Amino acid sequence: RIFSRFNALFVRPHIRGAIREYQTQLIQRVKDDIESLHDKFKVQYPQSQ
Amino acid sequence: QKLKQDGDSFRMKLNTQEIFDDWARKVQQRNLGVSGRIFTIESTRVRGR
Amino acid sequence: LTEEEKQQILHSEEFLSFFDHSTRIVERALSEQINIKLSLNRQFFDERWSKHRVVSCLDWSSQYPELLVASYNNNEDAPHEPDGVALVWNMKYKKTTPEYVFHCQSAVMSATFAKFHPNLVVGGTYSGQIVLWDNRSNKRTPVQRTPLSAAAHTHPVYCVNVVGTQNAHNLISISTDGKICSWSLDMLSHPQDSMELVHKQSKAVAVTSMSFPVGDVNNFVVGSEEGSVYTACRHGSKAGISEMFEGHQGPITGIHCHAAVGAVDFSHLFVTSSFDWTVKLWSTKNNKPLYSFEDNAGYVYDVMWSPTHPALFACVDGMGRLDLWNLNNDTEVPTASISVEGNPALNRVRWTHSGREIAVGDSEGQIVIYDVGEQIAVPRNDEWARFGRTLAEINAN
Amino acid sequence: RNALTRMPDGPVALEESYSAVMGIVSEVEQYVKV
Amino acid sequence: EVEETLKRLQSQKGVQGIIVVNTEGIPIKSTMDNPTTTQYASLMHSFILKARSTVRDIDPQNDLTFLRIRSKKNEIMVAPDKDYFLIVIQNPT
Amino acid sequence: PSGKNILVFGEDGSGKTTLMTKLQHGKKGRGLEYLYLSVHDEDRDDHTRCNVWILDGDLYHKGLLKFAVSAESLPETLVIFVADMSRPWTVMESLQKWASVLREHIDKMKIPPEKMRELERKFVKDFQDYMEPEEGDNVLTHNLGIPVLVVCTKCDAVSVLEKEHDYRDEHLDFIQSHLRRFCLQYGAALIYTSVKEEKNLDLLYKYIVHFTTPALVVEKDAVFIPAGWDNEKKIAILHENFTTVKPEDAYEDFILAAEDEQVFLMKQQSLLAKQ
Amino acid sequence: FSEILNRVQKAVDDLNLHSYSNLPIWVNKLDMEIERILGVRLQAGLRAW
């Protein structure tokens, strides 16, 4: 939500090279969610209830 | 780009036209004229008895 | 021994009810002693009548609990039993034994209580065969049989309605085509409002678990085929469906109007839960989802608002996860959250009228009853208007 | 019944065959244990 | 309906034996040992008639709908009304 | 007294593990499913080891039969031929292959005992002979004989049969006729059972484990042909109506790894196809 | 063992990610050798049990 407030600001140098570590933190979160999606799609619809 | 390709291939996993194609083609080629019986909603069907 | 005359004397008419009293009070007397805030309240399941019953709706007991009709869509798990399952239970004694068995001769689909009656139970089936039961005694035979002609229904009765008072005992039975029939709650011969839900487009409205406004309001919100919140009235200048405020997807499996006002305003709001893997907030001035909730993993089926704290709902999903949220307190997260046995695709959720406990129904039998002891008497009108203002300031850019 | 494309998976005969043979092997040593 | 009746009567856990004593005083339809409890229920029919006269003559507005006989050895949790007295001896634990 | 034994034989499922589940088990992967009991052999049950053994297929089950069949076992070896009805083309094959199994089994390990000719063959010429009396004509049996009593499991699919390939009773008459003929040729009695259905097995099997049974053929689906009621008149009435006169062709009526490439080979091939 | 069989179909999913030449030949024939591995471990395990 904080990133959503200033998505477009992530261009300017003071904003380009100053959030990258927090950015990687959320990248890990995103990757975890993508993996959860993999776990969900592997449990296909006809196999599920 | 790593997670980009990850989500791209995983999005390509959603291309599951096996059962979808089976259902669509079977329904078309099977019920192409199945509802053509306009005799009545009360017919005769018996055996030797 | 040879007891046929004693079958008439001993097992007579009024003595069968006395035998029901004897069995009930001794089986209740089984709780004999020696003769020298997520808490998971209860859970009930019949291993003979609730077994593998793939159901979508039952008849809960908000008012007068500890006796709630488990009007199950009788599966083929017990073909050597009467095809139809309706089970009132005994939460007061906390038992699951098949004592209060109830049955019909068709797929019992959402057999709600009748109007002005705790014993009389009304209910549609797969072929629109609305049956009824007057259990003044301890009987179980469906004493009524609805005619099933062209004007009637042959599709599952999604959510039948009871409108009016002792004067107007109206019943709104609907099929999948959307044919509304307002059967009087006395005679099963003529449905008063036996019309079609004519709308701007696709007059044969594929309704899916509609919802009934609080306050005897006819401005219903029909859940349909792809979200499709059909907002309308049954009569007046807009007897058919006036419009369809949507933005929700899939067949609505849960939609509910305003809860019981704690200290808030009337709060003309509602919510929707369906195949879009989520719940979406709504009101009377939106035309779009007021606040689309978290699209959780799997089909979010049911949702229900609580009476104690009016600004909090509860919703399960395709992977059995009940999430009860009060965005005026817990916005980004639910107030309480707990899964069900495993991660199945459930179908029902219903708050207890007493609040701080809820009876959630699975779509395959067993019914769980969770306990959440958090809310007390608080003026949530302030937080209500403030959060509405926060959303009104967040949507802007 | 599967909404995917792994039709070239391991085998449609392997998985429960091992458990079936292990089941009879367990049946002998357990039911004739008396 | 003797099905649900006998079902919920004898099927109840620890129920040794019920006695559906009628005005006759003989438990021919029950789950107790009939050759032993026949005379028992007849004698108890007369003495429970004494008890009915007692409880209903000293205080006429007091019926007898459930007799939880908590003995030193058995749970005779009798289920009466004005019609019967289900004298049921049940396993204590 | 003494213990008993039962040898059940089945093919392609057709109700074998479930049949012994319905006798009164973990899995099924290597045959020989033992079954210890307490059999009421007309008076009491003192934990009598009436050991029943499950056996299906043909891929080396003689070791199982070695742990099952023995020297002093054969006089009351109530063998059971199990064949369903859903796939009759596989059923005709099943009973035929199992008939070959029992013939070569008798001609494999049952033939060395010499006393069994004038003892066991007399038991056969008593068994299949006393079969028709004390129950309910010319039961034409083969050269074989052992306590044969065919019990066809998985028969709770007649509606599925008419829903798949019968829609009348030709498959309920011709198949009944010729399989009843095969069973009478085996010296047995055609019995049918299903999942908790067609209760007629405790009568004859308890009658030979040392309470009678009637016989009708009007059913034609849950075919109960008890002890010695098998002949070739009723079957002639069965395999004649609406089908050919005594047919043998009704049986036939109901009856991508692409490639890879190379490098040097493909390179020289490319220079070759350069043109 | 069953976990690595799940990893085998995971590798099948890895092969479903992109284009291959003898993908079912590769999987199924390695599964044939896996059945031979199952033969070694099965005779050892059955003799063990």
Curated annotation (Swiss-Prot), chain B:
Transmembrane segments: none annotated. It is found in: Cytoplasm, Cytoskeleton. Dynein heavy chains probably consist of an N-terminal stem (which binds cargo and interacts with other dynein components), and the head or motor domain. The motor contains six tandemly-linked AAA domains in the head, which form a ring. A stalk-like structure (formed by two of the coiled coil domains) protrudes between AAA 4 and AAA 5 and terminates in a microtubule-binding site. A seventh domain may also contribute to this ring; it is not clear whether the N-terminus or the C-terminus forms this extra domain. Homodimer. The cytoplasmic dynein 1 complex consists of two catalytic heavy chains (HCs) and a number of non-catalytic subunits presented by intermediate chains (ICs), light intermediate chains (LICs) and light chains (LCs); the composition seems to vary in respect to the IC, LIC and LC composition. The heavy chain homodimer serves as a scaffold for the probable homodimeric assembly of the respective non-catalytic subunits. The ICs and LICs bind directly to the HC dimer and dynein LCs assemble on the IC dimer. Interacts with DYNC1LI1; DYNC1LI1 and DYNC1LI2 bind mutually exclusive to DYNC1H1. Belongs to the dynein heavy chain family. This is Cytoplasmic dynein 1 heavy chain 1. It comes from Homo sapiens. The chain holds residues 680 to 728 of 4646 of the full protein.
Curated annotation (Swiss-Prot), chain C:
One of its GO terms (molecular function) is dynein light chain binding. Keywords: Acetylation, Cytoplasm, Cytoskeleton, Disease variant, Dynein, Host-virus interaction, Intellectual disability, Microtubule, Motor protein, Phosphoprotein, Repeat, Transport, WD repeat. It is found in: Cytoplasm, Cytoskeleton; Cytoplasm. Pyrophosphorylation by 5-diphosphoinositol pentakisphosphate (5-IP7) promotes interaction with DCTN1. Serine pyrophosphorylation is achieved by Mg(2+)-dependent, but enzyme independent transfer of a beta-phosphate from a inositol pyrophosphate to a pre-phosphorylated serine residue. One of its GO terms (biological process) is transport along microtubule. WD repeats lie at residues 50-99, 103-143, 152-193, 202-242, 247-292, 295-335, 341-380. One of its GO terms (cellular component) is dynein complex. It comes from the Eukaryota. Its main location: cytoplasm. It is linked to Neurodevelopmental disorder with microcephaly and structural brain anomalies: An autosomal recessive neurodevelopmental disorder characterized by global developmental delay, severe intellectual disability, microcephaly, dysmorphic facial features, and cerebral malformations including simplification of cerebral gyration, agenesis of the corpus callosum, and brainstem and white matter hypoplasia. Belongs to the dynein intermediate chain family. This is Cytoplasmic dynein 1 intermediate chain 2. It comes from Homo sapiens (Human). The gene is DYNC1I2. The chain holds residues 208 to 624 of 638 of the full protein.
Swiss-Prot record, chain E:
It comes from the Eukaryota. InterPro entries: DYNLRB1/2, Roadblock/LAMTOR2_dom. GO terms for cellular component: centrosome; ciliary tip; cilium; cytoplasm; cytoplasmic dynein complex; dynein complex; membrane; microtubule. It is found in: Cytoplasm, Cytoskeleton. Acts as one of several non-catalytic accessory components of the cytoplasmic dynein 1 complex that are thought to be involved in linking dynein to cargos and to adapter proteins that regulate dynein function. Cytoplasmic dynein 1 acts as a motor for the intracellular retrograde motility of vesicles and organelles along microtubules. The keyword Transport applies. One of its GO terms (molecular function) is microtubule motor activity. High expression in heart, liver, brain and pancreas; moderate in placenta, skeletal muscle and kidney; low in lung, prostate, testis, small intestine and colon. Isoform 1 expression is up-regulated in 64% hepatocellular carcinoma (HCC) patients. GO terms for biological process: microtubule-based movement; visual behavior. SUPFAM superfamilies: Roadblock/LC7 domain. This is Dynein light chain roadblock-type 1.
Curated annotation (Swiss-Prot), chain F:
GO terms for cellular component: centrosome; cytoplasmic dynein complex; cytosol; dynein complex; kinetochore; late endosome; membrane; microtubule. It is found in: Cytoplasm, Cytoskeleton. Homodimer. The cytoplasmic dynein 1 complex consists of two catalytic heavy chains (HCs) and a number of non-catalytic subunits presented by intermediate chains (ICs), light intermediate chains (LICs) and light chains (LCs); the composition seems to vary in respect to the IC, LIC and LC composition. The heavy chain homodimer serves as a scaffold for the probable homodimeric assembly of the respective non-catalytic subunits. The ICs and LICs bind directly to the HC dimer and the LCs assemble on the IC dimer. Interacts with DYNC1H1; DYNC1LI1 and DYNC1LI2 bind mutually exclusive to DYNC1H. The keyword Acyltransferase does not apply. It comes from Homo sapiens (Human). One of its GO terms (molecular function) is dynein heavy chain binding. Acts as one of several non-catalytic accessory components of the cytoplasmic dynein 1 complex that are thought to be involved in linking dynein to cargos and to adapter proteins that regulate dynein function. Cytoplasmic dynein 1 acts as a motor for the intracellular retrograde motility of vesicles and organelles along microtubules. May play a role in binding dynein to membranous organelles or chromosomes. This is Cytoplasmic dynein 1 light intermediate chain 2. The gene is DYNC1LI2.
